[PDB]
Design an enzyme around this catalytic site. Sequence first.
Site, PDB file in Angstrom:
ATOM      1  N   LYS A 120       1.867   2.226  15.023  1.00 30.55           N
ATOM      2  CA  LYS A 120       1.008   1.122  14.613  1.00 30.55           C
ATOM      3  C   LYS A 120       0.407   0.358  15.786  1.00 30.55           C
ATOM      4  O   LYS A 120      -0.617  -0.307  15.607  1.00 30.55           O
ATOM      5  CB  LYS A 120       1.789   0.152  13.725  1.00 30.55           C
ATOM      6  CG  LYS A 120       1.744   0.478  12.239  1.00 30.55           C
ATOM      7  CD  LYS A 120       2.571   1.710  11.906  1.00 30.55           C
ATOM      8  CE  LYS A 120       4.055   1.453  12.111  1.00 30.55           C
ATOM      9  NZ  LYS A 120       4.876   2.642  11.756  1.00 30.55           N
ATOM     10  N   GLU A 204       5.257 -10.755   9.317  1.00 32.25           N
ATOM     11  CA  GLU A 204       3.870 -10.956   8.921  1.00 32.25           C
ATOM     12  C   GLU A 204       3.839 -11.867   7.698  1.00 32.25           C
ATOM     13  O   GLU A 204       4.849 -12.470   7.317  1.00 32.25           O
ATOM     14  CB  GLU A 204       3.188  -9.608   8.649  1.00 32.25           C
ATOM     15  CG  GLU A 204       3.786  -8.845   7.477  1.00 32.25           C
ATOM     16  CD  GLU A 204       4.938  -7.950   7.891  1.00 32.25           C
ATOM     17  OE1 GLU A 204       5.429  -8.096   9.029  1.00 32.25           O
ATOM     18  OE2 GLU A 204       5.358  -7.104   7.074  1.00 32.25           O
ATOM     19  N   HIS A 239       6.157   0.838  -4.126  1.00 26.28           N
ATOM     20  CA  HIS A 239       5.193   0.958  -3.041  1.00 26.28           C
ATOM     21  C   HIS A 239       4.440   2.283  -3.104  1.00 26.28           C
ATOM     22  O   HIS A 239       3.770   2.650  -2.130  1.00 26.28           O
ATOM     23  CB  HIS A 239       5.873   0.846  -1.664  1.00 26.28           C
ATOM     24  CG  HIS A 239       6.422  -0.512  -1.345  1.00 26.28           C
ATOM     25  ND1 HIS A 239       6.159  -1.616  -2.129  1.00 26.28           N
ATOM     26  CD2 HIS A 239       7.263  -0.938  -0.373  1.00 26.28           C
ATOM     27  CE1 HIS A 239       6.780  -2.669  -1.628  1.00 26.28           C
ATOM     28  NE2 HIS A 239       7.456  -2.286  -0.561  1.00 26.28           N
ATOM     29  N   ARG A 296      -5.233  12.632   7.798  1.00 22.23           N
ATOM     30  CA  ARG A 296      -5.200  13.836   6.981  1.00 22.23           C
ATOM     31  C   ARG A 296      -5.971  13.595   5.687  1.00 22.23           C
ATOM     32  O   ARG A 296      -6.436  12.489   5.409  1.00 22.23           O
ATOM     33  CB  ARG A 296      -3.756  14.258   6.689  1.00 22.23           C
ATOM     34  CG  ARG A 296      -3.143  13.585   5.472  1.00 22.23           C
ATOM     35  CD  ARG A 296      -1.692  13.217   5.713  1.00 22.23           C
ATOM     36  NE  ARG A 296      -1.167  12.387   4.635  1.00 22.23           N
ATOM     37  CZ  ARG A 296      -1.125  11.062   4.666  1.00 22.23           C
ATOM     38  NH1 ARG A 296      -1.577  10.381   5.705  1.00 22.23           N
ATOM     39  NH2 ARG A 296      -0.623  10.407   3.625  1.00 22.23           N
TER      40      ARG A 296
HETATM   41  N1  LIG Z   1       1.388  -7.957   0.530  1.00 23.60           N
HETATM   42  C1  LIG Z   1       1.832  -7.245   1.643  1.00 23.60           C
HETATM   43  N2  LIG Z   1       1.945  -7.960   2.768  1.00 23.60           N
HETATM   44  C2  LIG Z   1       2.370  -7.369   3.897  1.00 23.60           C
HETATM   45  N3  LIG Z   1       2.686  -6.036   3.892  1.00 23.60           N
HETATM   46  C3  LIG Z   1       2.570  -5.322   2.749  1.00 23.60           C
HETATM   47  C4  LIG Z   1       2.150  -5.900   1.630  1.00 23.60           C
HETATM   48  N4  LIG Z   1       2.123  -4.980   0.645  1.00 23.60           N
HETATM   49  C5  LIG Z   1       2.526  -3.817   1.157  1.00 23.60           C
HETATM   50  N5  LIG Z   1       2.791  -4.042   2.453  1.00 23.60           N
HETATM   51  C6  LIG Z   1       3.202  -2.726   2.806  1.00 23.60           C
HETATM   52  O1  LIG Z   1       2.380  -1.800   2.443  1.00 23.60           O
HETATM   53  C7  LIG Z   1       3.266  -0.573   2.481  1.00 23.60           C
HETATM   54  C8  LIG Z   1       2.971   0.287   1.423  1.00 23.60           C
HETATM   55  O2  LIG Z   1       4.079   1.202   1.272  1.00 23.60           O
HETATM   56  P1  LIG Z   1       3.802   2.821   1.538  1.00 23.60           P
HETATM   57  O3  LIG Z   1       2.701   3.279   0.613  1.00 23.60           O
HETATM   58  O4  LIG Z   1       5.084   3.603   1.261  1.00 23.60           O
HETATM   59  O5  LIG Z   1       3.325   3.072   3.124  1.00 23.60           O
HETATM   60  P2  LIG Z   1       2.263   4.251   3.568  1.00 23.60           P
HETATM   61  O6  LIG Z   1       0.828   3.759   3.333  1.00 23.60           O
HETATM   62  O7  LIG Z   1       2.510   5.471   2.761  1.00 23.60           O
HETATM   63  N6  LIG Z   1       2.482   4.610   5.182  1.00 23.60           N
HETATM   64  P3  LIG Z   1       2.123   6.206   5.781  1.00 23.60           P
HETATM   65  O8  LIG Z   1       3.175   7.125   5.383  1.00 23.60           O
HETATM   66  O9  LIG Z   1       2.047   6.157   7.350  1.00 23.60           O
HETATM   67  O10 LIG Z   1       0.772   6.686   5.217  1.00 23.60           O
HETATM   68  C9  LIG Z   1       4.767  -1.148   2.321  1.00 23.60           C
HETATM   69  O11 LIG Z   1       5.512  -1.084   3.694  1.00 23.60           O
HETATM   70  C10 LIG Z   1       4.592  -2.313   1.984  1.00 23.60           C
HETATM   71  O12 LIG Z   1       5.680  -3.172   2.403  1.00 23.60           O
END
Ligand SMILES: Nc1ncnc2c1ncn2[C@@H]1O[C@H](COP(=O)(O)OP(=O)(O)NP(=O)(O)O)[C@@H](O)[C@H]1O
EC number: 6.4.1.1
Lengths: 422, 91, 91
Positions: A120, A204, A239, A296
């Site tokens: 990140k 955050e 999530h 991707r």
């Molecule tokens: N309102 C929010 N404020 C701050 N962070 C958030 C908020 N909502 C979601 N996040 C984060 O957004 C992420 C979404 O989860 P997730 O979809 O599993 O990650 P991802 O997009 O798949 N990462 P990657 O595998 O690298 O593509 C979670 O870590 C949440 O905690």
Amino acid sequence: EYKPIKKVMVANRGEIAIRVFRACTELGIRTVAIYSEQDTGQMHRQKADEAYLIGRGLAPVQAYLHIPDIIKVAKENNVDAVHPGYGFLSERADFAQACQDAGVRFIGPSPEVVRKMGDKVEARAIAIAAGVPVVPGTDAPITSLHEAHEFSNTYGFPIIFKAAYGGGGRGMRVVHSYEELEENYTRAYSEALAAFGNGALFVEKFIEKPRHIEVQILGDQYGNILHLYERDCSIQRRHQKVVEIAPAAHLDPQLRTRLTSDSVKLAKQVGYENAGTVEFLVDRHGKHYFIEVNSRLQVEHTVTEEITDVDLVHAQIHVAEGRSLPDLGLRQENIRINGCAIQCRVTTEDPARSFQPDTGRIEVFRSGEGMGIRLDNASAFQGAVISPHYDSLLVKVIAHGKDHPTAATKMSRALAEFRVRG
Amino acid sequence: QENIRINGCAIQCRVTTEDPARSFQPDTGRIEVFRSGEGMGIRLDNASAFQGAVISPHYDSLLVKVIAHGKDHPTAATKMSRALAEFRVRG
Amino acid sequence: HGEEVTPEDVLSAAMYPDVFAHFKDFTATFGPLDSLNTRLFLQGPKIAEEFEVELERGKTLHIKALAVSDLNRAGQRQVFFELNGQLRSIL
Ligand SMILES: Nc1ncnc2c1ncn2[C@@H]1O[C@H](COP(=O)(O)OP(=O)(O)NP(=O)(O)O)[C@@H](O)[C@H]1O
């Protein structure tokens, strides 16, 4: 204009393999398939022209992660191009570098761009470099409760810890008070140091009513970048994506055009040259806050693929060939909105206990084909056995209609038509 | 009238249990394997096609209706080529 | 019975024409041999057992035998084979 491709091999399983095999058969390119011993009863094996086994004495989930076997099997069979899919070696620049060093073409971005993405810190720095606002918070990884206390005091009381070393949810818990703050931080730090690797944490501001919008970006090696369209997937059980809607639900034209411009500018500054996804976040008041960029092809590409009637796999193959975007006749002004689409995924999780995945043998299977109904069968057939070693996807269903309620009703009918017993 | 507009091209085909060799004579029997070939812009309508089905020698001999929608005529022609190659009806 | 006969087969036919015709007729019906195991070719697939047959460099397939039915009306039996993931019935 460059060296034409005569053979393509893929390193994934399930629906991606089927899709790319259809794409290659459309252009008359020979196909090479790979599979593990514990996964010898699928359909993609018989779909391709030739199949070979990998990971003979490896773990069922680790058999697809062994680079040298893939490299040697590609070398022996005179394979020219290899496709990375998603979820298997797609986000590891080591495989891309090895493929480049082996003289085999890689369907995707350069290893330098992949290394720039991933963690990140670099993406966040690139984002703050030019526009594209990011969520306020700490910059460096946080491992102390004190600095976390000043960060909470400065920005706001409700905060959430976000971890590194893995994109999954992991320990995403939100702090709303002080007494629970210390114990939650200690528990999260212990989980990060013990169950995971680096205990990198960031503090955050948790958005009370989040809404994230995705945008696809397609690039060539001649420095031409085209945005496809936007996507909304706010339906998350915890999530994870559940149901996808193709266009924007209700977005102001200024908002959508500004988001498009920001995504295009970010792609140009990074100089992305393939198919990727840009993820943002929208508040109720409206603040596009940068999250990350996917290098991707996303699984939810089919909605945009259906709206604009543009085949993305053909575009990726032809751009890996060397042909420029104008040669393909793809222009930003040549695409238009046509209808709406809804995307859904068939899983084997018990919808009562905890969405706990289930295992068993399929006894009765029927499928529903409709008007704007398109079906992608991964491993669904008569007398099939699902393994718990991998994901639990049966069928990827997309419904297209003239209006959102119309597509919803058509998909409702289609699911009512589906019949899975066992 | 104003809300109706042309969008792309389409091709329609029907599969039938007739012998294109001798006289387009219909054939009867039992099917031993059936597989689907639905794809990106491919629409399928299955009348009566399942594993172990029996074809009556006195009714209609239509099995499946396949349709392609594409941006251009050659595109849909290729989609029919690939889809018909993917289909497998033996016996 | 010639569709791709090569000069080698032409010379073989001049050696023993009768057995060559019989061998070609047998091979056309039951299919390509010498991809099977010797014990499989002599004895056959024992019930409730799964085996493997190699055809080309990538064409590799598996068979499992399930059960055998009884005579229906005309001295015919039905056999249920389980292929990679599917079921086929043969008479
Ligand atoms: N309102 C929010 N404020 C701050 N962070 C958030 C908020 N909502 C979601 N996040 C984060 O957004 C992420 C979404 O989860 P997730 O979809 O599993 O990650 P991802 O997009 O798949 N990462 P990657 O595998 O690298 O593509 C979670 O870590 C949440 O905690």
